[PDB]
Amino acid sequence: SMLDDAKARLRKYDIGGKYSHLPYNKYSVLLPLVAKEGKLHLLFTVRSEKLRRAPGEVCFPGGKRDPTDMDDAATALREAQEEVGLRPHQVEVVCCLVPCLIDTDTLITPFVGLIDHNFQAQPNPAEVKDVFLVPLAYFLHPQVHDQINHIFEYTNPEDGVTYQIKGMTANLAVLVAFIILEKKPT
Numbered sequence: 001s002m003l004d005d006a007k008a009r010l011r012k013y014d015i016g017g018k019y020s021h022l023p024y025n026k027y028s029v030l031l032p033l034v035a036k037e038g039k040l041h042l043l044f045t046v047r048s049e050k051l052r053r054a055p056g057e058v059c060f061p062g063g064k065r066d067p068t069d070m071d072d073a074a075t076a077l078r079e080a081q082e083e084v085g086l087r088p089h090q091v092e093v094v095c096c097l098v099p100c101l102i103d104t105d106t107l108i109t110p111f112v113g114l115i116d117h118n119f120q121a122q123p124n125p126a127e128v129k130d131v132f133l134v135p136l137a138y139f140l141h142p143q144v145h146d147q148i149n150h151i152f153e154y155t156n157p158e159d160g161v162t163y164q165i166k167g168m169t170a171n172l173a174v175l176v177a178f179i180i181l182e183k184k185p186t
């Protein structure tokens, strides 16, 4: 099946806990895969305009590890619940992708999660201004604007709203799309 095929592909790229004990300032992100209308989508947030870091930017759910977290995956799931109301029974964490090093002292660990079809986002407005889906296939043929660095513009055909997706968030989206969608019979 589509979902079994995605999980099988993803597992081949799982680094697991290899980098998890290293003494960094630690953050995790959840790359949430949603199946709608027979296709996979990624779920993104738009960060509230009131956050100090990166107000109004498109981001995956996630945040800083805290002492309660059993592991880095727990961080991602805790933060996703806080930001968009995703409950743990509503997500299957399939793998841990390559971590992202930033600022010389920070390591961001991305986890891919399969999201239950009955999940409906409840954006927490103190953290998230919007939640939206993008089809995973978009990231194979994105609409690129050069601001010099590359920015994706995605327009939701449901409402005509355009989102800008940049940086680590854009990079990770492409990676997930390659992993899951490369070399597939039609």
Ligand SMILES: Cc1cccc(CC(=O)Nc2cccnc2)c1
Residues within 6 Å of the ligand: 027, 028, 029, 045, 046, 047, 048, 059, 060, 061, 062, 063, 083, 108, 127, 128, 168, 169
């Ligand atoms: C791509 C990336 C880079 C750095 C940190 C994060 C996690 C995060 O802060 N997510 C978040 C927070 C609040 C609202 N929406 C999303 C993600």
